[model samples]
Target: IPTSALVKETLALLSTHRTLLIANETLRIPVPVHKNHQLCTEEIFQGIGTLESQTVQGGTVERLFKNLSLIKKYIDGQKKKCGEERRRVNQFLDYLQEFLGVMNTEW
Candidate 1:
């Protein structure tokens, strides 16, 4: 292929990689508040860690989904019965829902 054609193909691939990078960044979250909360912040930490590590390397849709899945696992473990726990879980879920909506719109 000509140089121009090669450059065009390279740009296309870079665009896709950029999309994955955006997806990876979008999923980061604050550590869970309070030890009383059943959800493990550690999981979120680990999940985000992978996302961050992939920043330079880029990411995949599958990787993005896996991070979201890990977040959901944390959400499932959380105790939402009362007080800070309830607020925290609700906020987390709200963030999760909002991000999914944004992703839907973007994709």
Candidate 2:
């Protein structure tokens, strides 16, 4: 495909998806955001190496980094918990199936 065709398709998708382009000093994270959705302002600020909230305990840069790290850890922890719950539910279903099979044989 030609460059113009690619650009046209990209622009079409961008318009349809309503993407937000954010450039940070250290990290440029491409986040897909919609107009109806509410964004975490702190995360956006942290991505640009700044703090959205003022803190008396620490500097802006330090607080931003720490807050970002905490957010990451919290998200990771939730993902881990979800996986564990899925595994437990699967195990329970397997056990129930086995029990049902035994009951059918006895009947």
Candidate 3:
């Protein structure tokens, strides 16, 4: 296809699908986010339970880091809705508390 024709076709398709695209986008976002929060809390604690009486080192550090990275990515993706900087600071405190608790108790 010629460049101009391709552009026109693409724009036409986009216009046709614009409503569907937006509705789909909205649907992609998790609803009842509070429920999600509660579910995530339970799941996270379950994951932590796997670490009971175990030292966090080597692969453990990597696992902590991988989950942390996913949390960062989720926060970054929502940066426009909630301030990324605020989330970063809050999450930092959360980690700090968890880390200190582990440091104090899990030895």
Candidate 4:
């Protein structure tokens, strides 16, 4: 459902995860495994930086959506909504709606 309620749900999650990431004053959230993932905390920051650049160049929302999906993959293994899991879901949901607004201009 693309209702306003839906927007609330998505934003709720996005803020959660975004907050989760920010919750750490020292960062290093979701554990570090010695140069483990190419798509992790560091990459997320890097990715967002790139998104900022692309947005400046008027890039499509596709790039942003891709990042959201990749972000979810990080917490997909989470069987339960713990801290990391919860944040990941929230962020993805929020990003989804914001993009839906742009991508669904056809509607």
Q: Which candidate's TM-score is highest?
A: 2
Candidate 1 lDDT, 13-67, residue by residue in tens? 5466565566544565566655533346456556556665666533454444444
On a 0 to 1 TM-score scale, where does candidate 1 land against the true structure? 0.22
- Writing each residue's lDDT as its tens digit, candidate 4 over 1-107 gives 33344445545555544432343354332444555353365555564554444333233344334445554454453423444444577798897898778656643
lDDT of each: 0.55, 0.47, 0.47, 0.49
CA displacement after TM-score superposition, residue 11 of candidate 2 (Å): 32
lDDT at 2, model 1: 45
The sequence of per-residue lDDT tens digits that candidate 3 reaches over residues 6-91 is: 45554554355344334323222223434335336445444434443242335334444344345444544555554435457788
On a 0 to 100 scale, what is the lDDT of residue 15 in model 3? 57
> Once superposed on the true structure, which residue ranges of model 4 sit more than 4 Å away at CA?
1-35, 50-57, 61-80, 83-107
Q: Give the TM-score (vs. native) of candidate 4.
A: 0.22
Model 3's lDDT to the true fold? 0.47
lDDT of model 2, residue 82: 51
Q: Number of clashes in model 3?
A: 0
Better of 1 and 4 by lDDT: 1
Clashes of each: 0, 0, 0, 5
Candidate 4 clashes between residue pairs 3 or more apart in a chain or in different chains: 10-94, 13-90, 13-91, 14-90, 14-91
Candidate 4 local Cα displacement, residue 88, angstroms: 25
How do the predictions measure up, each by TM-score? 0.22, 0.33, 0.23, 0.22
Root mean square deviation (Cα) for candidate 1: 16.5
